[model samples]
Target: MSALTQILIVEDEPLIAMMLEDFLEVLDKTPVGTVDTVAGALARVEDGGIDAAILDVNLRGGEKSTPVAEALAARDIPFVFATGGSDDSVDSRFRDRPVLQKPFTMDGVAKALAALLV
Candidate 1:
């Protein structure tokens, strides 16, 4: 079967979100939505076409993206947390999930997605 194609980007930073979209496009993956908040991400997840997600651990207003993470987990959708902070930023419960430390390259994105798609 083909690898997952639909991707959800949950980032509050405009530049980061756009960059991710560009990378996904170049990689031949379709980004279903670029959302900036827990609420927005939750809505997209509930909308139900996402194949995988690249989620920022933090959002605007100091809101955590953990809720979005939990929702995706509930649906059995694989995801990678992209963070500029240390691994401690993520809740211990999700510590086992893959993480892409910030300043990550397109290759890092590729590898993380492959970990899930494979």
Candidate 2:
């Protein structure tokens, strides 16, 4: 059997995380991991088997989620920033990846994930 399409989510807010998770579950895709901090993100990356990721640009820990982005980049994994920041603020590398703005609907999340899938 083929491996599941794993979607990782790096979000700091419990409510938002739950929303995303529930949305993904309804879509029947694997929610590979959910992390609340940059450190948690790195740890998840190190654990491996992620196919794509949705990242929150701002973490409560006062650090940009760039480290997780970098790790995902190094692995050539598809990812997007689930942020409230303007598109212009994103790093050059992440320009091509989808950015699902906060307060997105289930359709929006599905659409974003669809674009990243091979």
Candidate 3:
């Protein structure tokens, strides 16, 4: 890909979210923005300019981010779910998409992002 891949980060974990931003820059990826809440993420997605996303599972109150998933999937914007464990964390509908296994390596993030953009 000649142009930078613009990625949105939907992560409630502030520490983890910061890490992804660093990885994105080193990988030559652009983060359109970072959002920790469902509403914030949905707004960014709706506003557009997002090319892809790194969607972390879970937020405050143990909420899974399926609503964000629905919007992204509906718009045909591909994404990888960030996870520390198994598939149970993600919805069945999005199981087919890639997952960014936690304790993330820069290569792992890059691999998942490349897979979707391709």
Candidate 4:
């Protein structure tokens, strides 16, 4: 079998972070890390071992994931924004990236990761 994909989930809400952890687990994806702040998320990224990421566009400290996204971009790692916002709300630099809109299901997560990993 192929190695399991490791995904870093960057979400500020405790409930949403827990939900994503459970959701990814149910889909057979490995949850490498789950963080509540952009700074923490960046620390995870800097530490490496991330195959990809699922990031919330906005965080608790009024910080966006743009810099984290930049790090992923430099490393050529694929990631998607998981947000309630529409595509237009995303930073222009990340418009080409895939997005998993809020209120997403397991199927949506799976499909988005599949395409991203490819």
> TM-scores of the models, in the given order?
0.86, 0.81, 0.85, 0.83
Residue 76, model 4, lDDT:
89
Error of 2 at 48 (Å): 0.9
Q: Give the lowest summed-lDDT range of ten residues in model 3.
A: 84-93
Model 4: which residue pairs collide?
A: none
lDDT of 1: 0.78
Give residue 48's error in model 1 in angstroms.
0.5
Model 4 Cα displacement at 75 (Å)? Answer: 0.7
Residues 26-99 of candidate 2 have per-residue lDDT tens digits of 77777878878787888888888777788876787646668878877789888877766442366667767787
> Largest lDDT belongs to which candidate?
1
Question: lDDT scores for all predictions?
Answer: 0.78, 0.75, 0.76, 0.76
Error of 3 at 74 (Å): 1.8
Better of 1 and 4 by TM-score: 1
lDDT of 4 by residue, 1-118 (tens): 2354688988766666787788777877788888878778888999987788888778887565578888888998888876664323777676666776656677877777777865
Model 4 global lDDT (CA atoms, 0 to 1): 0.76
The segments of candidate 1 whose C-alpha lies over 4 angstroms from its true place after superposition are 85-88
Model number with the top TM-score? 1
Candidate 3 wrongly placed segments (more than 4 Å): 1-4, 85-88
Off by over 4 Å in 4: 1-4, 85-88
Q: List the residue pairs that clash in candidate 1.
A: none
